[PDB]
Amino acid sequence: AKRTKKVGITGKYGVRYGSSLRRQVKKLEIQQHARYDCSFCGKKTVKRGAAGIWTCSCCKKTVAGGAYTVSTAAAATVRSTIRRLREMVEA
């Protein structure tokens, strides 16, 4: 059954630290502890260690990433921007 109505993972902190702080932490800690899809093997086995490091269980590939998610919006913009610049030079 569903055990908490809204706190979720941040029920480990109980009554402490304040609701807004626990909410911010919740939002980030979900991403933190999630499983993501490998760009290389196509499987959903990417977990983090050691903020910024995302390992695939299978395939053993390790990607540099964000601290609580694999890809940040900034780096997405960067790879698209750099692609556009490279193509502006050679295409």
Partner 1 sequence: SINQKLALVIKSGKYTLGYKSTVKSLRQGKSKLIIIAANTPVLRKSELEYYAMLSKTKVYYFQGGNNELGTAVGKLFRVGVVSILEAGDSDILTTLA
Partner 2 sequence: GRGAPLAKVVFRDPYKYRLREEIFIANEGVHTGQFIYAGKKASLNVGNVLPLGSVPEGTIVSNVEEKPGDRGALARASGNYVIIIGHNPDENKTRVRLPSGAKKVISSDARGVIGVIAGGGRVDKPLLKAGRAFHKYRLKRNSWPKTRGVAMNPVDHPHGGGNHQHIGKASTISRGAVSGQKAGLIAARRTGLLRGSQKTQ
Partner RNA sequence: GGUGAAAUUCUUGGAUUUAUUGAAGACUAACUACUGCGAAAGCAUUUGCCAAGGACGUUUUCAUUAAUCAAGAACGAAAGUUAGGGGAUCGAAGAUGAUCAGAUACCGUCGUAGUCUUAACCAUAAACUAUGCCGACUAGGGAUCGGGUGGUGUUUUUUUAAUGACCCACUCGGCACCUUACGAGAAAUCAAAGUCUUUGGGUUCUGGGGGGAGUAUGGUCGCAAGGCUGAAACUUAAAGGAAUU
Which residue number, 1 or 89, has a Cβ lying nearer to partner 2? Answer: 89
The values of phi and psi at residue 63, to 5°, are -120, 140
**Residues 54/65, Cβ–Cβ less than 8 Å:** yes
16-23 contact pairs (CB < 8 A, 24+): none
Which residue number, 43 or 83, has a Cβ lying nearer to partner 1? Answer: 43
**Residues 56/40, Cβ–Cβ less than 8 Å:** yes
In the list 42, 52, 79, 83, the residue contacting partner 1 (rule: CB under 8 A) is 42
Which residue number, 37 or 75, has a Cβ lying nearer to partner 1? Answer: 37
End-to-end distance of the chain based on CA atoms, in angstroms?
Answer: 57
Catalog residues that contact partner 1 under the rule CB under 8 A: 39-43
Site residues, partner 2 (CB under 8 A): 13, 17, 21, 24-25, 28-29, 40, 50-53, 60-69, 71-72, 74-75, 78-79, 81-82, 85-86, 88-89
